[PDB]
Structures are given as structure tokens and as C-alpha cells.
Amino acid sequence: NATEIRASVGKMINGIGRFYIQMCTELKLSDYEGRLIQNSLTIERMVLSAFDERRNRYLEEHPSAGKDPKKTGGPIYKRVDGKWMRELVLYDKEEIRRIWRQANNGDDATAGLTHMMIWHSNLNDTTYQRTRALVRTGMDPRMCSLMQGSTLPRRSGAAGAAVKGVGTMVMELIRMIKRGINDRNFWRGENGRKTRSAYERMCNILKGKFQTAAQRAMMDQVRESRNPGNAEIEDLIFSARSALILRGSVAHKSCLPACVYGPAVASGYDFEKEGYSLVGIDPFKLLQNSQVYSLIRPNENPAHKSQLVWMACHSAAFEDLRLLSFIRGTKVSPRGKLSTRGVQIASNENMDTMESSTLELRSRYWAIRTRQISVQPAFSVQRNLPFDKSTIMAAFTGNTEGRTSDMRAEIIRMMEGAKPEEVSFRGRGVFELSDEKATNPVVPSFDMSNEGS
RNA sequence: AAAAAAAAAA
């Protein structure tokens, strides 16, 4: 029921805004800096730690320059006498749940935290790429594709599971495979249920992302295997090479910083009355008139970091830059061209040379966020052009084989052409901001001079 | 109803 959904999302974002207002008011940040991105990431880490597990004191090799469970603080940067300064005394965590249950006066907002994580997810994904798994596990050159989705560091992401993308899901199989390559020998006993069941369900869902029943049954046949090994790994690798053209149903969730909902509940926003539309115009009209600023480091382009936060809010990193560009009204360039580093501020970075800058998060046109259209008609027909050469040498890849079975005939038939599906299809539904009812769409005209990625 | 377990980020 979409009605209760928009009701509940209005409620949760209203609760977020209220908790926003209060959480600020304690430490008393002035509202210009109270609607600012650094306090945005502070409250974000607070809601990151808000609902934890049992009490744990266990510590592992390589301490983290320290740790304390009594209370928790965050990077604090305040413009004092016109000059910013970072400071810290820590703040209790129980108190946090006490204030959060007051904000969600009687029923807490779990999906609210999921949506905050959604904010975090496009933030981190668009930010950059780390490769510590690369220094740990062996990995195929899938990165070479230059196109890969990524998950956040949040366990038990049942909701995340829906939005989730495919490539990193196979990677997650590989992560369990790493736990199993460093398998503690002393692990014989009841243990195995959670593992077998988890493998079952994750394999299920990774299969369920796409459509064609062939790879569905292939993924089931990898499932029924009792002892996952490198043969399963290479089978998943083919399946990934295919997923390149037979893309997965990777949905995109749009979320903004909480310093926007805060002044939006301060903007007399009766969210529930209109509801909210995470897939809808609502983030855009909220951002169209919002006011968010960010500590631009030295040698950084306000516009580049502006587009970075724009993508963090639109969940648009794994989308065609041409479309984004046509939607914002100014060229959306590859992250590499962004004269900017991460929005966060490493605790070592000096504040002496730090400066703030206004975020430009507006968009010329608006557009909806899908993952079905048979063939998007281009005025001069588009093809989703068939570049299948790296897949030629991929089907070669040392001439060993594809998935070895009837699948091999299925792949030596998929070789040529079937026109049965699409790939990386994020529906535009582009409209003028002056056309809220989305009465007339705008056939986009993209500049081919823009790196597709 | 009844559902898994470790470490900071350019």
C-alpha cells in the first residue's frame, strides 16, 4: 500500500528532523552551522551507533590508537570569532537512545535509520574507491569494467538487501569464502546452520535480482553444492561477466543530509500530510530550496564537491553521467575530474587552512529513479550499443571454459544476439520543475562528448 | 511467533 508507505516515510523523516533539531540544540551549534554538513556527519555517526548489540569489551590485535565505551564524540568544527576550530568531549550512548525514543515520541524509526544509511551509502559510494579487500582476498579484474556497485558497512541489511547490487553480492560470497579459507580448524559442532542457511538465502537473492531463468538455475546449481570452492568462484565470475550486459535489478535510493530535514521540519513541513516520495520529486524540491554548506579544503573546487554531494543525495554514481548532466543542467564529470577529495575531514587534516563553501544542490530538471520499458525510443534510435569484445576474450579467458554444463551451449548461443533484456536501466521520467504533476516529460539530448562514466 | 558476527574513512 503506497498510501501507508508515504504516511510512514513522512513520519520517519519528521522524526529525523525533530531529533536533528534537538541533537544540535544541546551542544548549541548556530543554525547556519547548525544546518551544516560536518554536524550532519556528526549526528550521522550518532545515529550510526544508536542501536548496537550486547556489551562487548573484546579487543583484537592492532589497536585503533584507542577506544572507550562509556561515551562517544564526533569531529566538532565551529566558526569561533570568524575562525573555525575542532574540539571534543565525548557524549553518552544510552542518553542517545533516551533522546531518540523521545524524538520518535513512542515508536522508534528503524526505517529512518535505514534511510540515513541510504544517505551514507551514496555518500561513500560516490566518494571514492578503497581496495583493502584487494590486499586481503584475490580478486578478478572486474574493476576493469570501471562500473561496480558497493555496500555499506552495516550488518543484517534486510532492507539494504532489496536495493542491493549484484557484483558486490558475489563479492560477499567471496567474503564468506575468505572467512572459510582462514577457517579456524577448531570449528566443528552446531556451527554450520547459520552458515548453510545464510549461503542458501544470499544465493537465492543474488539469483532473484535478475530475470532470465537460465542463470537462475545455474545459481541454484551453485547453491546445491555443499563445499564452495574456486570452481564455484570461476562460475560466479562468468556469471558476473554476463551480468555486465545482463545487468542486475540494482535499485537506486535517493537520500539527503539530515541538516536538510532539520530545517525542513523547521520549514513548517507537515510531511505526513503530503507524505514523502524517496523515488519522487520530494528530495528535489527539498534540495531545490535547501541551504547546506561544506568545509571546502584548500585546492578544492566548490563546484566539484557540490556535484559530489549532489550525487550523494541522488544516488547517481552508477548512473550514466549524460543523464545526470541533462538533469542538473551543468556537466556532471567523472569523479576523477572532480577537483575535490572526501566530504569528511580526517582527524589529522589541519583546520588552520580550512574554509566553508555553499553547496549547490539544485537541478534544472527533475527525474524519477527506477531500477519496465521494452525499448526506450531515441529520436534517432538508440541501441544500448553492443560492445561485446572483452566478453569475447572473457569467454576465452585462457580458453578453459564458461560455466561447464548445458550452460556452455547456452552461452555459445547467447554469443550472437537475442535482444531479450537490458542493462543498467535507471528510468529518467525527466520533467521541468514547473511541471510537478509530471504532465510533460522532456526527451533528453545528451552531449556524446561526455565520458559515459 | 522464532531470522548472521569485528574494526576509522581519500
Residue numbers in the entry: 21 to 391, 405 to 486
What does the paper say about this structure?
Influenza virus ribonucleoprotein complexes (RNPs), composed of the polymerase complex (FluPol), nucleoprotein (NP), and RNA, are essential for replication and transcription. We report atomic-resolution cryo-EM structures of mini-vRNPs in two states: FluPol located inside (State-In) or at the outer rim (State-Out) of the NP–RNA ring. In State-In, interfaces for FluPol dimerization or Pol II interaction are blocked, but fully exposed in State-Out. These structures reveal detailed FluPol–NP–RNA coupling and suggest a conformational shift in RNPs during the viral life cycle.
In the NP+1:NP+2:RNA unit that represents the RNA encapsidated by NP in the regular position of RNP, the RNA-binding grooves of each adjacent NP form a continuous path and play a dominant role in stabilizing the vRNA. Unlike NP-0 which binds the fork of the double-stranded part of the vRNA, each NP in the regular position accommodates ten nucleotides in a linear sequence and the RNA bound in RNA-binding grooves locates on the inner side of the NP ring. The D72-K90 loop in NP+2 does not fold into an ɑ-helix; it undergoes a conformational change to adopt a more open loop conformation positioned above the linear RNA. This structural shift enables broader surface coverage and stabilization of the vRNA, thereby protecting it from degradation. In the NP+2 unit, the density allowed us to model 10 nt within the groove; we propose that the remaining nucleotides are attached to the surface between adjacent NPs. The minimal distances of NP-0:NP+1 and NP+1:NP+2 range from 10–15 Å, suggesting the inter-NP orientations may be flexible, possibly necessary for forming native RNPs.
